[PDB]
Amino acid sequence: IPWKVPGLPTPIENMILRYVKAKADWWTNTAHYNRERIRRGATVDKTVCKKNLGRL
Amino acid sequence: GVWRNTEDEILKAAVMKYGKNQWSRIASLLHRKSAKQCKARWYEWLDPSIKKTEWSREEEEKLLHLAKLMPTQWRTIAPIIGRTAAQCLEHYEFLLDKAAQ
Amino acid sequence: TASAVVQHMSLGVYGFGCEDSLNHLLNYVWPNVFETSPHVIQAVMGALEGLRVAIGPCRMLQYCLQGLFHPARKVRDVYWKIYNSIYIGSQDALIAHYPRIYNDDKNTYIRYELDYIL
Amino acid sequence: AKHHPDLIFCRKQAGVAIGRLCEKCDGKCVICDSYVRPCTLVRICDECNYGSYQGRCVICGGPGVSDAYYCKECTIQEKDRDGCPKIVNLGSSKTDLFYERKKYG
RNA sequence: AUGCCUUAAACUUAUGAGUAAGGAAAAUAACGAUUCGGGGUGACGCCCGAAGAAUUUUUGAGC
RNA sequence: UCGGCCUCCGAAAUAUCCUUUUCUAGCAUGUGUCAUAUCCUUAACUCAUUGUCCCUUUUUUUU
RNA sequence: UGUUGUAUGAAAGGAGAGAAGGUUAGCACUCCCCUUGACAAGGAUGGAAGAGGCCGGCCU
Numbered sequence: 029i030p031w032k033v034p035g036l037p038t039p040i041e042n043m044i045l046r047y048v049k050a051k052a053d054w055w056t057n058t059a060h061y062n063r064e065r066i067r068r069g070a071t072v073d074k075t076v077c078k079k080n081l082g083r084l
Numbered sequence: 085g086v087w088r089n090t091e092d093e094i095l096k097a098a099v100m101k102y103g104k105n106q107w108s109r110i111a112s113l114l115h116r117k118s119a120k121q122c123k124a125r126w127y128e129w130l131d132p133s134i135k136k137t138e139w140s141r142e143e144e145e146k147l148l149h150l151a152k153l154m155p156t157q158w159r160t161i162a163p164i165i166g167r168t169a170a171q172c173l174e175h176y177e178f179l180l181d182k183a184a185q
Numbered sequence: 186t187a188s189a190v191v192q193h194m195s196l197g198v199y200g201f202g203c204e205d206s207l208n209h210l211l212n213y214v215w216p217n218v219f220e221t222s223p224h225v226i227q228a229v230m231g232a233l234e235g236l237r238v239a240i241g242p243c244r245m246l247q248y249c250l251q252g253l254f255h256p257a258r259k260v261r262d263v264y265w266k267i268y269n270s271i272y273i274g275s276q277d278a279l280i281a282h283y284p285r286i287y288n289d290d291k292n293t294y295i296r297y298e299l300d301y302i303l
Numbered sequence: 304a305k306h307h308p309d310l311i312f313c314r315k316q317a318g319v320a321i322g323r324l325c326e327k328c329d330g331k332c333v334i335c336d337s338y339v340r341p342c343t344l345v346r347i348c349d350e351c352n353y354g355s356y357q358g359r360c361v362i363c364g365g366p367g368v369s370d371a372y373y374c375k376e377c378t379i380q381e382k383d384r385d386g387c388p389k390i391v392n393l394g395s396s397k398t399d400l401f402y403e404r405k406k407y408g
Numbered sequence: 409a410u411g412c413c414u415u416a417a418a419c420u421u422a423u424g425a426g427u428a429a430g431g432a433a434a435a436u437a438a439c440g441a442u443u444c445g446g447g448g449u450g451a452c453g454c455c456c457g458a459a460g461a462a463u464u465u466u467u468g469a470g471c
Numbered sequence: 472u473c474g475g476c477c478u479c480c481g482a483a484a485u486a487u488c489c490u491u492u493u494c495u496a497g498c499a500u501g502u503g504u505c506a507u508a509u510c511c512u513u514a515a516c517u518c519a520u521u522g523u524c525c526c527u528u529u530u531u532u533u534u
Numbered sequence: 535u536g537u538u539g540u541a542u543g544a545a546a547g548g549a550g551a552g553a554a555g556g557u558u559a560g561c562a563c564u565c566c567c568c569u570u571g572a573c574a575a576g577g578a579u580g581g582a583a584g585a586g587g588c589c590g591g592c593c594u
């Protein structure tokens with residue numbers, strides 16, 4: 029959903045876009061290698077399969 | 085099943101308080117309505133941005149042109165005209181009947 | 186529901202001298218005789234039939250009297266169907282309680298025997 | 304019954320037959336339909352205990368299992384003196400229930 | 409009235425079949441065709457039928 | 472020619488806290504109306520039933 | 535030539551176990567502990583608080 033906040037100062041908005049992009053990379057890489065572990069059989073935990081399905 | 089008067093009133097007020105991402109909280113207020121039916125009723129009919137006015141001449145011309153363009157695709161068409169897809173659909177059929185006479 | 190309470194409370198205290206409460210409650214029950222809904226209308230009639238056996242046929246006839254010959258059929262038939270209930274339940278006791286109607290030109294209406302003096 | 308305006312009492316001259324009530328109707332008053340304070344025994348007219356009907360329920364018509372009484376309030380109002388209190392017509396409610404179950408079942 | 413995880417839940421927000429009878433709103437249909445007769449009603453409601461040129465001024469009695 | 476895997480314990484489930492005694496542990500100090508939905512309500516309202524419909528064809532169990 | 539130097543558990547009597555509809559899952563931030571050989575894991579997600587300004591109160 030596109031995020032815009034109309035009043036917000038641009039130092040603050042630049043900082044927020046910076047850190048949201050960092051969290052997005054951490055999230056997406058974790059999705060990437062937990063899928064590999066699920067496919068190879070390395071995980072046996074069912075909650076990590078549920079979380080990966082949700083992220084995917 | 086069908087929407088009473090008082091149910092629509094509850095649904096408008098509850099969306100005004102709880103917003104548009106909590107349909108499970110809104111379904112708890114109504115009788116025998118699920119969350120999906122509440123959402124569908126809101127976007128179909130009860131949303132204030134839905135315009136229930138008469139059709140302008142411009143809006144009709146865009147309707148006839150876009151219905152020629154992408155036939156039967158009313159969800160794609162409908163935000164370009166700014167009516168609900170059901171509204172767009174029945175008004176198209178109205179004009180087609182009218183041109184038959 | 187209050188008329189149902191009056192019906193049942195009326196028949197319980199029969200013979201015990203509680204007639205002032207019951208007559209007081211008749212003053213509230215009685216304007217509801219012009220209701221038209223059947224459930225309410227049969228609860229009111231039940232209350233009056235209970236009250237006839239607790240405060241007597243004389244009071245109940247004194248309530249009906251003025252509307253038995255009233256100009257409107259609406260007031261009249263409701264009043265007549267209260268009278269019939271009093272008449273069926275207590276036909277004999279009403280002999281002492283009827284009013285005095287005067288004689289007109291060709292018919293005599295005074296019950297002269299009761300007017301006898303010893 | 305008092306709950307059904309279309310039901311109709313027999314009201315003929317009651318006789319020496321004692322009216323009875325089926326298990327469903329046990330303990331209630333035939334006129335005003337109450338559960339409390341039984342005052343007098345119910346008598347039914349000759350025709351209403353004719354033949355096979357001898358001993359059926361007064362109020363509904365099922366196999367009778369105990370004697371029927373009038374309550375105290377119907378005695379004081381002398382409702383016990385109006386006649387045979389046997390109900391002579393099934394009415395709309397009983398008939399509708401039959402066709403509804405039969406449609407379904 | 410605290411941040412996060414798969415909106416935390418890939419959990420649920422149930423309530424049978426009928427009988428008889430009421431109350432309240434939403435919605436919706438009309439406004440002045442006058443009087444007379446008949447229907448109806450306590451009374452109305454309501455209903456059925458019927459129908460700027462002429463004596464004191466500016467369109468002349470003047471010739 | 473031969474070829475021989477393992478064996479079990481507790482926790483994440485029946486809370487927690489306060490008051491008075493009991494047991495023990497550990498300490499520390501001291502020059503209105505027509506025509507339509509709906510909502511609310513009323514009546515100890517009911518939860519199927521088996522009770523000869525035998526009527527009908529020129530139709531009738533044979534010494 | 536005494537006394538408040540404290541705590542645990544139990545019994546009896548009371549209170550009752552997070553989630554802006556119901557039923558619940560958890561992981562933490564601070565400081566208060568308990569089980570534990572713990573740099574692990576549990577103890578209801580262990581329990582308890584959590585916006586700003588002025589002097590428990592007042593204002594947004």
Ligand SMILES: [K+]
Pocket residue numbers: none
């Ligand atoms: K913690």
Ligand SMILES: [K+]
Pocket residue numbers: 579
């Ligand atoms: K929990």
Ligand SMILES: [Mg+2]
Pocket residue numbers: 483
């Ligand atoms: Mg746990």
Ligand SMILES: [Mg+2]
Pocket residue numbers: none
């Ligand atoms: Mg855990």
Ligand SMILES: [Mg+2]
Pocket residue numbers: none
């Ligand atoms: Mg923990």
Ligand SMILES: [Mg+2]
Pocket residue numbers: none
């Ligand atoms: Mg738990």
Ligand SMILES: [Zn+2]
Pocket residue numbers: 324325326327328360361362363364365
């Ligand atoms: Zn019975």
Ligand SMILES: [Zn+2]
Pocket residue numbers: 332333334335336337373374375376377
């Ligand atoms: Zn009775």
Ligand SMILES: [Zn+2]
Pocket residue numbers: 313314315347348349350351387388389
């Ligand atoms: Zn009979």
